[PDB]
Design an enzyme around this catalytic site. Structure first.
Site, mmCIF file in Angstrom:
data_model
loop_
_atom_site.group_PDB
_atom_site.id
_atom_site.type_symbol
_atom_site.label_atom_id
_atom_site.label_comp_id
_atom_site.label_asym_id
_atom_site.label_seq_id
_atom_site.Cartn_x
_atom_site.Cartn_y
_atom_site.Cartn_z
ATOM 1 N N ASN A 118 -14.444 7.212 1.442
ATOM 2 C CA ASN A 118 -13.465 6.275 1.977
ATOM 3 C C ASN A 118 -13.253 6.484 3.500
ATOM 4 O O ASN A 118 -13.104 5.520 4.272
ATOM 5 C CB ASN A 118 -12.160 6.424 1.187
ATOM 6 C CG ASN A 118 -10.991 5.679 1.806
ATOM 7 O OD1 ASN A 118 -10.994 4.441 1.900
ATOM 8 N ND2 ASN A 118 -9.947 6.433 2.198
ATOM 9 N N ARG B 144 -19.246 24.403 49.398
ATOM 10 C CA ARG B 144 -19.457 23.210 50.205
ATOM 11 C C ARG B 144 -19.459 21.921 49.380
ATOM 12 O O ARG B 144 -19.094 20.859 49.873
ATOM 13 C CB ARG B 144 -20.748 23.378 51.020
ATOM 14 C CG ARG B 144 -21.185 22.147 51.822
ATOM 15 C CD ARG B 144 -22.161 22.515 52.942
ATOM 16 N NE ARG B 144 -23.340 23.227 52.453
ATOM 17 C CZ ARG B 144 -24.481 22.642 52.090
ATOM 18 N NH1 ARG B 144 -24.606 21.317 52.147
ATOM 19 N NH2 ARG B 144 -25.499 23.382 51.661
ATOM 20 N N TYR C 60 -23.519 25.925 47.857
ATOM 21 C CA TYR C 60 -22.889 24.839 47.098
ATOM 22 C C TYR C 60 -21.506 25.116 46.496
ATOM 23 O O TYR C 60 -20.646 24.234 46.490
ATOM 24 C CB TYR C 60 -23.837 24.393 45.983
ATOM 25 C CG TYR C 60 -24.992 23.550 46.456
ATOM 26 C CD1 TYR C 60 -25.384 23.554 47.794
ATOM 27 C CD2 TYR C 60 -25.697 22.755 45.567
ATOM 28 C CE1 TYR C 60 -26.449 22.785 48.231
ATOM 29 C CE2 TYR C 60 -26.748 21.998 45.980
ATOM 30 C CZ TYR C 60 -27.118 22.005 47.314
ATOM 31 O OH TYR C 60 -28.177 21.241 47.711
ATOM 32 N N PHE D 118 -3.488 6.241 11.853
ATOM 33 C CA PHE D 118 -3.630 7.659 11.555
ATOM 34 C C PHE D 118 -4.936 8.225 12.116
ATOM 35 O O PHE D 118 -5.190 9.414 11.993
ATOM 36 C CB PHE D 118 -3.574 7.889 10.037
ATOM 37 C CG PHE D 118 -4.458 6.965 9.260
ATOM 38 C CD1 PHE D 118 -5.834 7.126 9.275
ATOM 39 C CD2 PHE D 118 -3.914 5.920 8.525
ATOM 40 C CE1 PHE D 118 -6.666 6.248 8.560
ATOM 41 C CE2 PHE D 118 -4.721 5.043 7.812
ATOM 42 C CZ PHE D 118 -6.104 5.208 7.828
ATOM 43 N N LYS E 33 -18.165 45.388 39.882
ATOM 44 C CA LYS E 33 -19.349 45.121 39.070
ATOM 45 C C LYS E 33 -19.039 44.883 37.590
ATOM 46 O O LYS E 33 -19.732 44.119 36.925
ATOM 47 C CB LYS E 33 -20.388 46.239 39.221
ATOM 48 C CG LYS E 33 -21.670 45.997 38.433
ATOM 49 C CD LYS E 33 -22.669 47.146 38.591
ATOM 50 C CE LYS E 33 -23.266 47.139 39.998
ATOM 51 N NZ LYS E 33 -23.809 45.779 40.340
ATOM 52 N N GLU F 87 -13.773 12.085 1.619
ATOM 53 C CA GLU F 87 -12.741 11.563 0.722
ATOM 54 C C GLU F 87 -13.326 10.477 -0.169
ATOM 55 O O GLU F 87 -12.930 9.301 -0.099
ATOM 56 C CB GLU F 87 -11.561 11.013 1.534
ATOM 57 C CG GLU F 87 -10.248 10.925 0.754
ATOM 58 C CD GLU F 87 -9.642 9.510 0.761
ATOM 59 O OE1 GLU F 87 -9.412 8.928 1.853
ATOM 60 O OE2 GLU F 87 -9.402 8.977 -0.340
ATOM 61 N N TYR G 104 0.787 -1.233 0.000
ATOM 62 C CA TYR G 104 0.000 0.000 0.000
ATOM 63 C C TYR G 104 0.821 1.285 0.000
ATOM 64 O O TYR G 104 0.573 2.178 -0.807
ATOM 65 C CB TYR G 104 -1.044 0.043 1.125
ATOM 66 C CG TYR G 104 -1.772 1.378 1.166
ATOM 67 C CD1 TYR G 104 -2.720 1.699 0.196
ATOM 68 C CD2 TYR G 104 -1.477 2.331 2.144
ATOM 69 C CE1 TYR G 104 -3.365 2.920 0.205
ATOM 70 C CE2 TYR G 104 -2.122 3.559 2.161
ATOM 71 C CZ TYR G 104 -3.065 3.844 1.185
ATOM 72 O OH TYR G 104 -3.716 5.055 1.184
ATOM 73 N N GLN H 195 -25.226 26.406 57.088
ATOM 74 C CA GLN H 195 -24.429 25.806 56.023
ATOM 75 C C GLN H 195 -24.045 26.786 54.929
ATOM 76 O O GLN H 195 -24.794 27.699 54.604
ATOM 77 C CB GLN H 195 -25.159 24.612 55.407
ATOM 78 C CG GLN H 195 -24.944 23.320 56.138
ATOM 79 C CD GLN H 195 -25.555 22.137 55.414
ATOM 80 O OE1 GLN H 195 -26.533 22.274 54.650
ATOM 81 N NE2 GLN H 195 -24.985 20.953 55.656
ATOM 82 N N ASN I 22 0.788 10.774 6.814
ATOM 83 C CA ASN I 22 -0.080 9.943 7.615
ATOM 84 C C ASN I 22 0.287 10.085 9.069
ATOM 85 O O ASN I 22 1.432 9.845 9.445
ATOM 86 C CB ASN I 22 0.103 8.487 7.226
ATOM 87 C CG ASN I 22 -1.045 7.958 6.432
ATOM 88 O OD1 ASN I 22 -1.082 6.777 6.094
ATOM 89 N ND2 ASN I 22 -2.003 8.827 6.129
HETATM 90 O O1 LIG Z 1 -4.520 4.894 4.452
HETATM 91 C C1 LIG Z 1 -5.405 5.409 3.715
HETATM 92 O O2 LIG Z 1 -6.520 4.895 3.490
HETATM 93 C C2 LIG Z 1 -5.192 6.690 3.044
HETATM 94 C C3 LIG Z 1 -4.231 7.558 3.333
HETATM 95 C C4 LIG Z 1 -4.273 8.768 2.487
HETATM 96 C C5 LIG Z 1 -3.110 9.396 2.087
HETATM 97 C C6 LIG Z 1 -3.201 10.521 1.283
HETATM 98 C C7 LIG Z 1 -4.430 11.014 0.874
HETATM 99 C C8 LIG Z 1 -5.600 10.378 1.267
HETATM 100 C C9 LIG Z 1 -5.520 9.248 2.075
HETATM 101 O O1 LIG Z 2 -28.374 19.699 52.160
HETATM 102 C C1 LIG Z 2 -28.641 20.862 51.778
HETATM 103 O O2 LIG Z 2 -27.829 21.809 51.854
HETATM 104 C C2 LIG Z 2 -29.969 21.154 51.227
HETATM 105 C C3 LIG Z 2 -31.012 20.436 51.621
HETATM 106 C C4 LIG Z 2 -32.346 20.740 51.078
HETATM 107 C C5 LIG Z 2 -33.437 19.967 51.467
HETATM 108 C C6 LIG Z 2 -34.695 20.265 50.958
HETATM 109 C C7 LIG Z 2 -34.855 21.329 50.070
HETATM 110 C C8 LIG Z 2 -33.761 22.104 49.694
HETATM 111 C C9 LIG Z 2 -32.499 21.810 50.201
#
Ligand SMILES: O=C(O)/C=C/c1ccccc1
Ligand SMILES: O=C(O)/C=C/c1ccccc1
Lengths: 655, 653
Positions: free
Chosen positions: B449, B316, B313, B362, B418, B446, B74, B310, B222
């Site tokens: 192919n 935490r 998010y 390739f 801001k 191609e 080839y 708490q 290639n």
């Molecule tokens: O391995 C192939 O099928 C083709 C490689 C290639 C190289 C040049 C142009 C296009 C395809």
């Molecule tokens: O664990 C958390 O921080 C949130 C808990 C929770 C439970 C019910 C409604 C919304 C948030």
């Protein structure tokens, strides 16, 4: 130090063999265990009291006592979400009002765009993960609530839960909690889909509703149980479909006349992505001394310098294409299992050190991101399949097979698998659209408290949907392949009768050896399907060839015989050929419409499809429509029945 | 075993310690080696003959002998791609015409949308990987051709190659082949901007145009060289930026007054994704015995029952969030490195067994797909950052910090960060859009192919672009954090003078001890930034609180009233005269000690001291652009890794 095909073969066995799921805080629940529970009702759950009971009860009492005293914990004495400033001393009503406010999904009725409730299989899966989650002794939930869960799973009772509302899974989980405390608005299925209020459902399995203790409501609704349960059944399926398409690559090679060297171990050793080495290794084994690769070698030895020296990418590049696919499906399986076997919940109780720990184990991002990955990978499996399919349908690329795999000699009334070919485009197209990510659409939610959230469940559902399109594509691909094998075996049987006709007719007519030599070469070299419609038509490649070899033969000779005599015999040849040729080809064909596949590693797939599912070569004369044939194969893939021939096919690949 | 943070520290070390890249077909080229070749011009390539010359020559000879006596394989005697039906024994000019047909890209001139050619760093990286890929002895290329590549690399000569055209990397590679054979239409850079036609470029480094032998054209073109070279530098950056943001999560904790308990090892032990355990481990270490965590707990002990229990998010849940991201970045690195160190090329010559093997090395699918995954993960990194940044800007969520981190007491003329806040939404939005997959858009190519093709180079470029946006976000996040540290430290000094003034004023005026206690408590509890602008405004949170306390007091004391009111009155007179001046004196002093005990000190010093910045306010004349620009390009430079390393110094194992 394994090989993904042994692992997936391992998953499949666990799936059909397992009878009992051990839930005990220590023995791993695998993705095949979740799928088995969801899908096979004979498999039961076993909560092992000997393992976790004590650590669950120590955690239970520790939260009982304490929230009862002063203690300021997020779960028990505090408000929820962005409301964590609100402290209170009424433990049981805090818990029940949280469940109340989360009962906030919506059921659909005539939904065109989607199922109008979360499937029972996923609801039950989620029940299993929630239970399992509790076994780590980190939740503070009572042991009896756990027993109750176990007994609901084993009796096939589950709440009806709305499809949507989770940002990952407060709302979905509230429907399990609602069932448990017998909330009359929550409806529950008992086996037969038959439906009753939650309190009546608790009744039918010998339970009474619970009164939630401190922290119990939260422990019930905090968790990734729905996203992970669904991601579990998704991953199970992705492993088997993966192995399925890899395997079907070897079948494609056989029917399309590929060169199996594309899979030679040195090509891949030298570009050693694990997925590439392992998929190549399997393909090499599959194709080793195949009877079709022998037909292939024959085919490229005839007019060698006139035929493609290499296969197109859908075959030759299959292992390089599969590598990342197998690798993402495989390690996504590992990470969802990790999720499956975790305490997802908050706060986490550390009774040994006497304190509650405020974290975010309810956050389903491990799963959400990996669901986005696998959906992309399945889209890639689909592109593989679609490309192979495309090659098969087009005579310039199928190396002898007829366009559309259309058989019946009259092509004006047989458009073969052209309708499937169109569907494959539709399938693949929708599939690529589905692989866009869900995780990139995060909204700052719940009073800007949940400014980061995983969308795990939404992503799992979309990957679930991608898989269902893949099944459609495999079903079609497999039926096309079987169609191709019949055409390959008929092709060979037709070539023989043409050779036997040309030979025995060269004999009858007294033709010289030189002339007979060329005519037979043509009979061997010209592909039958280019002229099966009308074998004696002078514009089709057979007679085009034969007549050229006659001229070439009268030219080489003519001198020391008689040129005039040769033409007369040649005319007699052509005339006898117009009498006998089409007749002989027809009978051989008719006979075939009710043997090499018998020696192939894919016999299991051909036999399964042809005689276990009862189908035949597709033609104008078989009554069945393409739908009827593909439907059977698809049903077998959707069922799991397709794994029987898959395991027969891979039997003894081991290592 | 292991630990991602150690691995990444390891990459940063390699990146700036390496001097010579060893190319010998056996020792790994790492993603850090590629980035260093690309970015540092003192690093040179060492093509090591003793290690791989022999299999290169043997292979080279095999091809030549297979070709010279005829005549069927080839690479060496067949037509390429969809024309594999075509046999010829005209071997040299076959190779020539293949390069000719692939010189098919297009350069742009004033493009707005894109850069309009592939950058030289990317091109040199490709050259390195094409070279390395020949060291395995599978290609049939001459040793001398490899020596020429080393020379061009070490002499900073590279071809200009069009940005687009690869489906993954024929076209882009044709330009490297085009240089090596001195094609006049291909242009080459030599270091300092200067450009010359390929023939003159070879000439400048003592080379002559090569005449290609059988298989050589294919061997050069290639390959996955450009996609993989880009993914290597992308992956190197994805690792350092990953670490940067994990570390910044800890700085956020410090400045937002979080509870460090979210990083407690037991929480993650019990949900054990390696990425979550490992990120929480870093965070736990960073926040252990932090002087800012002291302030946080100090803050939650006053009025505790009115303050959230708490954190939100973005803080935490950061370990749970980071987990998938570290994992995908970490193992996309492994897979691109596997690609870097492979023979991508076809056919593969098994000279040992006297055969050419026809496959598809390739095909850059491995890289293409993992680039789609990393891009999504960096989208997640950005979302984490945007969320943290949003929380910092909003007084309701920043726990005492002023809206917009706006300092100068007069807020009607100070709108703070801001502008950055808005910019951050713009960055995240584009980032999220970038994270759509490229691999889903595969076309049948191609002459049908290449009915399957990776699009890896395109995917690599989009991930590259995602990472560039990520740098912008980290720059802004970091400079908001330093602004925040100054505000926390100032806040502390300010609350002391308020306590001081109220206290001593209460005495000057002879107020009862019951009244003084209630007045002091208010000064402790009320967040200063809610009244800093007009401390004595009755409708602002200070005087409001004090005046209630004064009423609470006069009711309580019936155990003389008229004179207590006279003394309260004088209290307000005095407070009016003295309070604002004292807070201002302290504020002014602070503008040209808890961070000195922080593990994040090196980031603060770097930004504040090494980059020469200050607290942003109406009286510092520098714009936000001017300050973030300095942080940004320290991130773009790699200079940000000095404070990062100093910060993690000691994390060890
Ligand atoms: O391995 C192939 O099928 C083709 C490689 C290639 C190289 C040049 C142009 C296009 C395809
Ligand atoms: O664990 C958390 O921080 C949130 C808990 C929770 C439970 C019910 C409604 C919304 C948030």
């Amino acid at each position: 130090s394994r090989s993904h095909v042994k692992d997936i073969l391992g998953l499949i066995n666990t799936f059909n063999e397992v009878k009992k799921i051990t839930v005990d805080g220590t023995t791993p629940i695998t993705v095949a265990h979740v799928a088995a529970l969801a899908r096979r009702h004979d498999v039961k759950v076993a909560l092992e009291a000997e393992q976790c009971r004590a650590r669950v009860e120590t955690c239970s009492s520790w939260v009982q006592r304490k929230a009862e005293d002063g203690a300021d914990i997020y779960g028990v004495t505090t408000g929820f979400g962005a409301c964590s400033s609100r402290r209170t001393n009424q433990l049981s009503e805090l818990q029940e009002s949280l469940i109340r406010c989360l009962l906030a999904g919506v059921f659909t009725k005539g939904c065109a765009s989607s199922v109008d409730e979360l499937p029972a299989t996923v609801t039950r899966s989620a029940m299993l993960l929630r239970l399992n989650s509790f076994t780590y002794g980190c939740s503070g939930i009572r042991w009896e609530v756990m027993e109750a869960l176990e007994k609901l799973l084993n009796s096939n009772v589950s709440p009806k839960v709305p499809l949507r509302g989770s940002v990952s899974d407060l709302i979905p989980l509230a429907y399990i909690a609602g069932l448990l405390i017998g909330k009359p608005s929550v409806i529950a299925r008992i086996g037969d889909d038959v439906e009753v209020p939650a309190p009546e459902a608790l009744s039918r399995v010998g339970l009474r509703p619970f009164k939630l203790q401190a922290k119990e409501g939260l422990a019930l609704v905090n968790g990734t149980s729905f996203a992970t349960a669904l991601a579990s059944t998704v991953m199970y399926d992705a492993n088997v479909l993966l192995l399925l398409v890899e395997t079907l690559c070897g079948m494609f090679c056989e029917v399309i006349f590929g060169r199996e060297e594309f899979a030679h171990p040195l090509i891949h050793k030298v570009k050693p992505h694990p997925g590439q080495i392992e998929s190549a290794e399997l393909l090499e084994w599959l194709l080793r001394s195949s009877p079709f690769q022998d037909l292939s070698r024959e085919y490229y030895s005839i007019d060698k310098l006139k035929k493609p020296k290499q296969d197109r990418y859908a075959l030759r590049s299959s292992p390089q294409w599969l590598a990342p696919l197998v690798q993402t499906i495989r390690d996504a399986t590992t990470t969802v299992e990790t999720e499956v076997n975790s305490a997802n919940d908050n706060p986490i109780i550390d009774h040994a050190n006497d304190r509650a720990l405020h974290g975010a184990n309810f956050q389903g991002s491990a799963v959400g991101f990996y669901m986005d990955y696998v959906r992309i990978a399945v889209a890639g499996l689909g592109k593989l399949l679609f490309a192979q399919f495309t090659e098969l349908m087009i005579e310039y690329y199928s190396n002898g097979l007829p366009g559309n795999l259309s058989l019946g000699p009259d092509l004006s009334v047989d458009y073969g698998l052209k309708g499937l070919d169109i569907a494959m485009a539709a399938y693949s197209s929708e599939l690529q659209y589905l692989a866009n990510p869900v995780t990139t659409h995060v909204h700052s939610a719940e009073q800007h408290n949940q400014d980061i959230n995983s969308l795990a469940l939404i992503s799992a559902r979309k990957t679930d949907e991608a898989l269902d399109i893949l099944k459609l594509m495999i079903a079609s691909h497999l039926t096309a392949m079987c169609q191709a094998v019949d055409l390959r075996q008929l092709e060979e049987a037709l070539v023989k009768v043409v050779e036997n006709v040309v030979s025995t007719l060269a004999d009858e007519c007294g033709l010289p050896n030189d002339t007979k030599a060329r005519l037979l070469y043509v009979a061997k070299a010209v592909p039958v399907y280019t002229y099966l419609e009308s074998p004696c038509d002078p514009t089709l490649p057979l007679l085009l060839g034969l007549k050229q070899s006659c001229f070439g033969s009268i030219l080489a000779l003519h001198k020391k015989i008689e040129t005039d005599t040769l033409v007369d015999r040649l005319a007699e040849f052509e005339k006898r050929l117009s009498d006998r040729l089409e007749n002989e080809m027809t009978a051989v064909r008719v006979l075939y419409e009710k043997v090499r596949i018998q020696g192939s590693r894919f016999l299991p797939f051909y036999r399964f499809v042809r005689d276990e599912l009862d189908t035949g070569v597709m033609s104008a004369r078989r009554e069945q429509t393409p739908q009827e044939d593909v439907q059977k194969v698809f049903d077998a893939i959707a069922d799991g029945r397709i794994t029987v021939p898959l395991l027969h096919c891979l039997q003894g690949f081991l290592g």
